[PDB]
Amino acid sequence: EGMKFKFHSGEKVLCFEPDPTKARVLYDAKIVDVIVGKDEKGRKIPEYLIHFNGWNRSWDRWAAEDHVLRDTDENRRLQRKLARKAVAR
């Protein structure tokens, strides 16, 4: 690998809505795999296979490190804020 990974396989996490057509929110999620990938420019980055809790494995997707947050009180609070803001009615 060479590089440093902030998260690890098996780690329960909060992952942002990966669909840009959808409201920004944080899902309860789990790291399922980790590789070295690339950004828009071809520069090496870390990437994570995310399974989203309560969603079947067809929703699994690769995310960049910054789209994933550690599951903490602090990020739980943010999850609440983002979720209640997304209610459109």
Swiss-Prot record:
Residues 9-67 form the Tudor-knot domain. Expressed in many tissues including liver, pancreas, heart, lung, kidney, skeletal muscle, brain, and placenta, with highest expression in skeletal muscle and heart. Changing residue 61 to A: Diminishes DNA-binding. It is found in: Nucleus. Changing residue 27 to A: Diminishes interaction with histone H4 monomethylated at 'Lys-20'(H4K20Me1). Changing residue 52 to A: Abolishes interaction with histone H4 monomethylated at 'Lys-20'(H4K20Me1). Coiled coil: none annotated. Disulfide bonds: none annotated. Component of the MSL histone acetyltransferase complex at least composed of the KAT8/MOF, MSL1/hampin, MSL2 and MSL3. Interacts (via the MRG domain) with MSL1 and KAT8/MOF. MSL3L1 gene undergoes X inactivation. It is linked to Basilicata-Akhtar syndrome: An X-linked syndrome characterized by intellectual disability, global developmental delay, progressive gait disturbance, poor or absent speech, facial dysmorphism, and mild distal skeletal anomalies. Non-catalytic component of the MSL histone acetyltransferase complex, a multiprotein complex that mediates the majority of histone H4 acetylation at 'Lys-16' (H4K16ac), an epigenetic mark that prevents chromatin compaction. The MSL complex is required for chromosome stability and genome integrity by maintaining homeostatic levels of H4K16ac. The MSL complex is also involved in gene dosage by promoting up-regulation of genes expressed by the X chromosome. X up-regulation is required to compensate for autosomal biallelic expression. This is MSL complex subunit 3. It comes from Homo sapiens. The chain holds residues 5 to 93 of 521 of the full protein.
